Amino acid sequence: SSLSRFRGCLAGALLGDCVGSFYAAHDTSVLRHVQSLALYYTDDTAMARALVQSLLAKEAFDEVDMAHRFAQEYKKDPDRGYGAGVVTVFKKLLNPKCRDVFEPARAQFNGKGSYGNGGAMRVAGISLAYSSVQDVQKFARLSAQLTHASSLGYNGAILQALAVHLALQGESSSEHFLKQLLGHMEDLEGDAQSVLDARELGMEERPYSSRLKKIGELLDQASVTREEVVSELGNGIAAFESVPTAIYCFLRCMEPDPEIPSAFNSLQRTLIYSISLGGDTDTIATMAGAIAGAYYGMDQVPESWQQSCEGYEETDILAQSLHRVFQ
């Protein structure tokens, strides 16, 4: 609702991308270099920017406008760190051929679609534009399907958009937050498309719902190692091995951590802990940051961290514009 939550959401995502990418590129050292504080953003922010700029330009989801903005952003800087798969979608959208803008995503991976976390890494803007939980699901799905036609991909984008949507409503028990997400994901993973996509990849049925139940079990435990978190939830490029991990980091870091100095606020702790899991740290931290930012607001975004991030001024402009146009 508040401008502070909109600004905190997009700043938190930007910090996750910039700080997470810094760690993914360079092998107590983490805590030292964050206190030290330009950090460049990656494809996570480039695509989040294009998604938000599309929503502002059309004052609504427009699949053609958003597809064009994704393709143009890619053409302008193809080296930001895109998944090797998704670049095929941008190259199709850039060529002059007459097509349905959703067709390149559908053709990915022998027509099964991408289950990568790229649909989820950029989706937070949907939950700033659309207040209704039905619209959040509908437009998180459609925005994701421009690149990610697999339900294993777009259900991760829906889960991340729902987590941001819930975080914007403010103070919640971890139990209430998790139950709400589990209710939606058990519904979505029971859909024929979700069942079919899971089985055609030789996967467990209901990967999101299973990981959300494991999050509840992990949060109930007195202590859990990073190895156990990564073993159970993942830290990878697949949406189902990163989106629940981001949500775990958000829920876990509502409590202080004996291993993270008490000088760090809850938002900073969430980002530090998510990066400590390793793997696809840019994308896990951008998603944990979006949720934490929406929840804690701009008061917990440290100015020294925000001002170290490439494009933080434009991110703040876009948060304020979303608030004006849609709120």
């Binding site: 990418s21 990656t42 494809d43 990878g236 490029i237 390793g278 840019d282």
Partner: peptide
């Protein structure tokens, strides 16, 4: 791969 990061 474990992650995606821009090239060195």
């Amino acid at each position: 791969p474990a992650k995606s990061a821009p090239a060195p």
